[PDB]
From a paper:
Our previous work showed that the C-terminal domain of Eed forms an aromatic cage that recognizes H3K27me3, leading to allosteric changes that stimulate PRC2 enzymatic activity on H3K27 (Margueron et al., 2009). To confirm the specificity of Eed-Jarid2-K116me2/3 interaction, we measured the binding affinity of Eed (ΔEed residues 77 to 441, see [Margueron et al., 2009]) for Jarid2-K116me2/3 peptides using isothermal titration calorimetry (ITC). Jarid2-K116me3 peptide exhibited ten times more affinity for ΔEed than H3K27me3 peptide, with a dissociation constant (Kd) of 3 μM. To further explore Eed-K116me3 interactions, we solved the structure of ΔEed co-crystallized with Jarid2-K116me3 peptide and compared it with the structure of ΔEed-H3K27me3. Within the two structures, the Eed aromatic cages largely superimpose and the Jarid2-K116me3 and H3K27me3 peptide backbones significantly overlap, despite some differences in the aa sequences. However, Jarid2-K116me3 peptide forms additional contacts with Eed (red circles). In particular, the large hydrophobic side chain of the phenylalanine at position +1 (F117) lies alongside the stem of the methyl-lysine and could contribute to the stabilization of K116me3 within the hydrophobic pocket. Indeed, a peptide in which the F117 was replaced by an alanine (F117A) did not interact with Eed and was unable to stimulate PRC2 enzymatic activity. We observed that both Jarid2-K116me2 and me3 peptides markedly stimulate PRC2 enzymatic activity on recombinant oligonucleosomes, similarly to the H3K27me3 peptide. This stimulatory activity was lost with a recombinant PRC2 complex carrying a point mutation (Eed F97A) in Eed’s aromatic cage, indicating specific interaction between the methylated K116 and the aromatic cage.
Numbering used by the authors:
A (entry chain A): 81 to 439
B (entry chain B): 24 to 31
The structure:
């Protein structure tokens, strides 16, 4: 259970499409989160009395840029937290969150970037998904494009979301073609390509770095949803995904007993384990989130209502749901984030408003 | 074929 202890609004008055607490922080450091909207990324510290202290912002040199998403990692070189951001321009900016300057940036996607994710074990491995139908894997330590996932059996419309599994051995992606696609990155080929991206030094060579063109996923399905799939998340070997049909579905490839790592690309069966129902969330690009321990699940709707499910139950159908509402919160909640200690939940909205809920 | 916004 939660209480709303504060709200504010950013002065660009554009949608805030993203929010991420920094889980890559240190001992006792203030709780910091980033918001992305318009052409800016903004950093806030959380304090008691529900105080939300604005720290710094980065505004893009290009007034036409519109950032959609961000993700935290560690800078392997300096050991400080880094923040990657991307949006409609299809350019990944790597931001020093301390100084809010762009250190470097990556171009290549033929269009808007819809989602960024860092590998759960290796801080240098950045995943991006794009309006151009492709996913790309980057090594941000050596600035290399490791692989492009797309083409023959790739997505056939915009890729909207993706997620590494817990170990960082595989990725599930989803998009406007209604499909969810599995891509193993622990194959001998991909492990080797990652090894090569680390061994690449452009000062000591004239060879360019060659990307892998992964045209075929290791599993694909369109039998979970009947519309844009705009958020996917691993729950162990299970998947949580949502379309714009008012439910998050909990499912797995193959039969109940089939191990995810035995699944073949020809596999045509799926097993649905649970469904989380809610209302008035039919627009696309509405993302759900989970706390650090994955004990809970949060999703906001298009009228400013915040759902939180208790996932701490034997079977998915059993989960109870809390709804958080405030008479002043009436705009689409695009995304939520939990602080690392699960004590704070933040929601950001289409009217540039930010909402703090304390556990 | 599918809207991203519910507001003006």
């Amino acid at each position: 259970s939660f209480k709303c202890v504060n709200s504010l609004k950013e002065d660009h008055n554009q949608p805030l499409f993203g929010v991420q607490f920094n889980w890559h922080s240190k001992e006792g450091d203030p709780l910091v989160f980033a918001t992305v909207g318009s052409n800016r990324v903004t950093l806030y510290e959380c304090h008691s009395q529900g105080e939300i202290r604005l720290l710094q912002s980065y505004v893009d040199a290009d007034a036409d840029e519109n950032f959609y998403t961000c993700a935290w990692t560690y800078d392997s070189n300096t050991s400080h937290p880094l923040l990657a951001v991307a949006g409609s321009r299809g350019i990944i900016r790597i931001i020093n969150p301390i100084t809010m300057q762009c250190i470097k940036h990556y171009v290549g996607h033929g269009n808007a970037i819809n989602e960024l994710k860092f590998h759960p074990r290796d801080p240098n491995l950045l995943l991006s998904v794009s309006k151009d139908h492709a996913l790309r894997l980057w090594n941000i330590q050596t600035d290399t494009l490791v692989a492009i996932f797309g083409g023959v059996e790739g997505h056939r419309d915009e890729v909207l979301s993706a997620d590494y599994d817990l170990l960082g051995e595989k990725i599930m992606s989803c998009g406007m073609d209604h499909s969810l696609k599995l891509w193993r990155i622990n194959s001998k080929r991909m492990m080797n390509a990652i090894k090569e991206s680390y061994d690449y030094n452009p000062n000591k060579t004239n060879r360019p770095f060659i990307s892998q063109k992964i045209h075929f996923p290791d599993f694909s399905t369109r039998d979970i949803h009947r519309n844009y799939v705009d958020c996917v998340r691993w729950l162990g070997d299970l998947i949580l995904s949502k379309s714009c049909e008012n439910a998050i579905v909990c499912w797995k490839p193959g039969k109940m007993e089939d191990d995810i790592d035995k699944i073949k690309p020809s596999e045509s069966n799926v097993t649905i384990l649970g469904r989380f129902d809610y209302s008035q969330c039919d627009i696309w690009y509405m993302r759900f989130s989970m706390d650090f321990w994955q004990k809970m699940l949060a999703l906001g709707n298009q009228v400013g209502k915040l759902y939180v499910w208790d996932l701490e139950v034997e079977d998915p159908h059993k989960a109870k749901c809390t709804t958080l509402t405030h008479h002043k919160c009436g705009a689409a909640i695009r995304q939520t984030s939990f602080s690392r200690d699960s004590s704070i939940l933040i929601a950001v909205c289409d009217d540039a408003s930010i909402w703090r809920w304390d556990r | 074929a599918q809207r991203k916004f519910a507001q003006s």
